């Protein structure tokens, strides 16, 4: 009765190509053009953040083969910086970053799925909120019922989005078959273009969170990252090239959802395929996220930080049912929220903050415990290059949003009351302890769940 290893190479590849590719490539590629004001420059801006993300991902193949604890960067932080730094990450992951990104991506599924029923005008808001919740519930039910099912669904929609991107790419090639201008030289333009590109590729670090369910980590994990990010970079460059076969610079910058505007121009009749497959592209991403989310919080309760109810696996199904319930509930609560998209904007840097701290931690680990096995070692300087480049592309985020990161840095302090109350207190209030126990056994009986055989 323990989480069984089930993730083959293909399912690891499906997870990481699944969660990277996103909506971004279909409905926000213009984020590069707005700052990189020439199409011949926009294609090299995508290649640059391609190779930058690759060297980042290699560093995570190192972390994930040097430390095999399967928390993702939460466990990587804890193994170097100890309890409280890792907790201040995990509290923000639980309360904000993992749920609000799930809810946003579910809503992007809802909108672009329903778009063909409302081609010219905004979709019914009251329906979109509901169809988001229908998706987040169903994929929680699947991942609660079976890991084999979860990974088969991820396989299916990781396929489905590449299938969509292939259609976009080949229509670009058809258009070329029929048959640097204006470039911004300025550092103050192109640096913000590059940063605006990394919001697309963000999602590569998500495979590290399932090192414990990976079948053969030392072989499969470094291979999955080598297999995926070149495929992604290639697909990004080719797909953005395909748009430049069809649309002008101005036309793209004023377009609402560029894959749909391209889709209309090429298909005409049946163009609704592209809205639908933009929907399916997101249907896959929510699954990949819920899976990953549940395993983060499951390591959170293993390390004794979160309440031990979340460690309790289903004994016949081998799925972390309480963690998936927690993941789902915290996601659905974002369905209340007002004017939501810029609330997340002040945490957009925080992903990079954690990656930076983790690779700095890997470099400290390379001298504090030099004797560890390390089946993968990269060049001494490659992490240092990547840290320096990451710190530069952290620094711009504060400059871009200084009062909002004033809220961002305020909200991480939420963890300090929680840490002293939950992690650290030495269990003084006996009348509350017997209630915690009572609630815990109730949940165990009610869900039929038990601790991990370890």
């Amino acid at each position: 009765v323990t989480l069984q290893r089930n993730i083959t190479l293909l399912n690891g590849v499906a997870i990481i190509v699944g969660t990277i590719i996103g909506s971004g490539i279909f409905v926000t590629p213009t984020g590069v053009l707005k700052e990189a004001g020439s199409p011949g420059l926009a294609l090299v801006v995508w290649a640059a953040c391609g190779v930058f993300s690759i060297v980042g991902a290699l560093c995570y193949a190192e972390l994930g083969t040097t430390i095999s604890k399967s928390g993702g960067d939460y466990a990587y932080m804890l193994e170097v910086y100890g309890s409280l730094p890792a907790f201040l990450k995990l509290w923000i992951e639980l309360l904000i970053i993992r749920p609000s990104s799930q809810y946003i991506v579910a809503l992007v599924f809802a909108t672009y799925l329903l778009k063909p029923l409302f081609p010219t005008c905004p979709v019914p808001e009251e329906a979109a909120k509901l169809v988001a919740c229908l998706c987040v519930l169903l994929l929680t039910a699947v991942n609660c019922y079976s890991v084999k099912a979860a990974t088969r669904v991820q396989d299916a929609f990781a396929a489905a989005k590449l299938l969509a991107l292939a259609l976009i790419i080949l229509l670009g090639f058809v258009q070329i078959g029929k048959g640097f201008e204006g470039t911004k030289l300025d550092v103050g333009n192109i640096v913000l273009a590059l940063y605006s590109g990394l919001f697309a590729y963000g999602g590569w670090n998500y495979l590290n969170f399932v090192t414990e369910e990976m079948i053969n980590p030392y072989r499969n994990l470094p291979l999955a990252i080598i297999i995926s990010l070149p495929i992604v970079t290639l697909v990004y460059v080719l797909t953005n090239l395909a748009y430049f076969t069809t649309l002008s610079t101005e036309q793209m910058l004023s377009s609402e959802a560029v894959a749909v505007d391209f889709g209309n121009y090429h298909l005409g009749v049946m163009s609704w395929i592209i809205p639908v497959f933009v929907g399916l592209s997101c249907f896959g991403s929510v699954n990949g996220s819920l899976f990953t989310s549940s395993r983060l919080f499951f390591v959170g309760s293993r390390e004794g930080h979160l309440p031990s109810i979340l460690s309790m696996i289903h004994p016949q199904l081998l799925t972390p049912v309480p963690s998936l319930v927690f993941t789902c509930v915290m996601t659905l609560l974002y369905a209340f929220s007002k004017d939501i998209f810029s609330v997340i904007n002040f945490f957009s840097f925080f992903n990079w903050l954690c990656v930076a701290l983790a690779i700095i931690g890997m470099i400290w680990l390379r001298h504090r415990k030099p004797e560890l096995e390390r089946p993968i070692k990269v060049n001494l300087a490659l992490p240092v290059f990547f840290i320096l480049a990451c710190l530069f592309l952290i620094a711009v985020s504060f400059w871009k949003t200084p009062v909002e990161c004033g809220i961002g840095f305020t909200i991480i302090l939420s963890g300090l009351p929680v840490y002293f109350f939950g992690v650290w207190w030495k269990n003084k209030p006996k009348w509350l302890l017997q209630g915690i126990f009572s609630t815990t056994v109730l949940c165990q009986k009610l869900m039929q769940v038990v601790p991990q055989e370890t």
Partner: protein, 52 residues
């Protein structure tokens, strides 16, 4: 900390809990299908776009 693997199964196998868990799974699926039918209601009842 919580209740050990074997001790839980001495209680949670009782017909009261089994009936309860059966009812919960079933009413969860009914509730979700209720959302699904609700969504179709909203979609059909809402006005279509002004055409070009």
């Amino acid at each position: 900390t919580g209740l050990s693997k074997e001790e839980l199964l001495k209680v949670a196998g009782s017909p009261g809990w089994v009936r309860t868990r059966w009812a919960l799974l079933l009413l969860f699926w009914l509730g979700w299908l209720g959302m699904l039918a609700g969504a179709v209601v909203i979609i059909v009842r809402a006005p279509r776009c002004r055409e070009l």
